């Protein structure tokens, strides 16, 4: 309570909220009055009158099981008018980032927000009114003297306040680890439990001087500690149990809940997949829309359910050993990883399944997975791990030598875990002797959406295909598709499309486009392909003849 | 007793609101040591979340001096800051710096820490130190002094800097010094050992009031080259015609009439076509034109500089600097000399620093880079290899190599 307040402002040019009070049942009014009275006695709020013009609605909501009433003030209007804040909560602590400690305590502070005073000049804005019953009186108005729940600035101002209060204790006790998450304090030490407990109550006393209680109901002295959704044992940690929906009939929203639970489970349960279930979310139009599970989605769900049946634990971090990250490929652009220091003793797991780009290959996605894990490792442990990757050094070598963008992966060892990541074809750097040469071209009418794709060859072959509902870029892709379709196992192709050349040169193995996908399929089945470019409309060789033909 | 210079953001622009990225343990520890010391010396002040601005902070270790250097990426702030062309506090660029045997670059950033910053502008300088595993919330500071990395600090300190160097510059008229950001570039035509010493002298003089060696004289333009063969295949000629057809939007009077007609018909790419004597003449003229710089290209100080880089393999990197498309002011080739040859990203980051350093020397400012790299690959690693106290503007391009024009 005696912390200095943090000054806060409205946004420039804006006044406080002036929102009418929704009428309310006397039962709610009576409960609001009771609660408000207690808060007033405790000094959290003060009575104000009608000469303050601001207002925010107050609602009354029921308790978890007691039937006790709960006061909510809907500050949506005040929040839009309150200045922005730079948030200081940069991330979420993760149990795999903890080192083993000899003595551990988890504590909370009680009434955290209501222990921090609010800027005196800002208080008028937090005005709310308890209505009379059917307007018997205008009603009773209060304003906040402390950080309100539901105000945009409360979390940051509390977090900063608590950092300032713990700063003296941290400096004086540098071999005591304090994880501070909002009002929740994890405290680990290498002290004997007698001396550790002494230090705990020194800490409690320090918080009490500054107006922070530490109620015993929230003081945990024995493992397993309940912390940040986990269970901390001395040697190992556990996610609190995850229960998945078990519907007969699934809506979009049900699926969204399921994928979410699975993502959360994937931090420790290896091999979780959500691609087929998430596919169900595409192109839907209501949260209430019933969605039948595809066969793939059902198999994916059952696979995950198997994985969940078995118990799992993570272990804690030992800084004197290396971090090792191992990735397996799961198919359809899905990846799963484990992070460990000793074999079969995971710190945590994870998955990477994002589709970046219309056109890509497994080597790029593996590179993205490496980058994701590398970022997560710096967040959690402040360093980057060594990688074990299911890709040969020859494959990686062929990739970064031929691919034109700069690329890199840090120190990694090949691990033989099929399926391995590979390039699925490689364009020839020189024209192939003995191969037929195809001059391809496609053109579309911007206005009509009609076009043609075709080719002419050094062996006297030629073909033109009419296309409907197409584009310029598709007719060019279509032209190459035709050349691959009608040619042998070795072929030289000459296009004037920088677009089509650019896609294919990057050796994609998958695409959101069915046409590109077909082309990839074709490329994989050839023995050798050389793909060359010429500028259009310069009357050059075969290109001129083929351009002439599509016309 | 010092008076601050009133400073404004540009009209209609707010301060920077850029999020801090994750930092390694050793960079966090370095920043916490540096920032508590700076807080003690009053150069920065601990702030809270009621200040809504932020700028990323990280650290770097130069290769020859292995203490950590704090680096606040004020690119966003600098873009939003008032021009000092208008308060007449800008710094002219001396031609002739590029004509010197050697140029030595000195980190002169600390000198800014003796001049207070306008009280109403400090909130825009906020930065946040992260914590390993988010054990604690971020810790926020703002500057009370001219901050390093801010474009305004050289402008405001400009009057003071000129006084400090007046004796050195009158004692040494042939030395040329240009100040860019936190850096002082010193150039001379003296032989290395002597040049160095006068650098030492300068260092001492600077210390009293309160490097990297470059040889611009040996940066060389790498022009477009046409292959030379005796037997030419249809594909060779096609590749040749497409290259010259592209070079014709840069150079004047390049023809492909003669080489192109050699390709009439629908021919196998492997078929060798002998050169007409006329096409051999066409090739000759084009070769000669490609040989000498383009006529009509001059630097415009009111326009931004742009740099493109292409990976060529085996440690080689081509680049072009221009202001308008196809009107290159400089084309070059960067080569890695480390010996490891293993890391594309480190090479590109060293290429970017070297190209930017040349622009500072030549034109007095860095270009905006078009980087041949995935945004996410660059952002995963580049700070591991950065060694400049400035950071240039950049964007990410995925441009497949149509013709390998520059190699
Ligand atoms: O690398 C791009 C990445 O850098 C950030 C840092 O968070 O900021 C810089 O980005 C651009 C690089 O030129 C500038 O436009 C910008 O001013 C600079 O801060 C991110 O904004 C960006 O995603």
Numbering used by the authors:
A (entry chain A): 3 to 553
B (entry chain B): 4 to 213, 231 to 427
What wording appears in the published article?
In this study, we showed that the Q151M mutation of HIV-1 RT confers high ETV and EFdA sensitivity upon HIV-1. The HIV-1 RTQ151M further enabled crystal structure analysis of HIV-1 RT in complex with ETV-TP. We also determined the crystal structure of HIV-1 RTQ151M in complex with DNA, DNA:dGTP, and DNA:ETV-TP, which revealed that ETV-TP is bound at the N-site, directly pushing the Met184 side chain.
For crystallization of the RTQ151M:DNA binary complex, the previously developed 38-mer DNA aptamer was applied, albeit with 3 base substitutions to trap guanosine analogue ETV-TP at the N-site. There are two RTQ151M heterodimers (p66/p51) in the asymmetric unit of the rhombohedral R3 lattice. The final refined model contains amino acid residues 3–553 for chains A/C (p66 subunit), 4–427 for chains B/D (p51 subunit) except 214–230 owing to poor electron density, and two DNA aptamers (nucleotides from −1 to 33 for chain E and from −4 to 33 for chain F). In the previously reported RTWT:DNA structure, the side-chain of Gln151 interacted with the adenine base of the dA0 via ordered solvent molecules, stabilizing base stacking with the cytosine base of dC127. In contrast, the present structure showed that the hydrophobic side-chain of Met151 keeps nearby residues, the base moiety of dC0, and solvent away, and that the cytosine base of dC0 is deviated by approximately 35° relative to the guanine base of dG1. Consequently, the present structure of the RTQ151M:DNA binary complex exhibits a more open conformation than that of the previously reported RTWT:DNA structure. These results indicated that the bulky, hydrophobic Met151 side-chain increases the flexibility of the N-site and forms a distinct conformational state in the absence of dNTP/NRTI. In contrast, apparent local conformational changes were observed in the β2-β3 region of the finger domain between the binary and ternary complexes with maximum atomic displacement of approximately 8.5 Å.
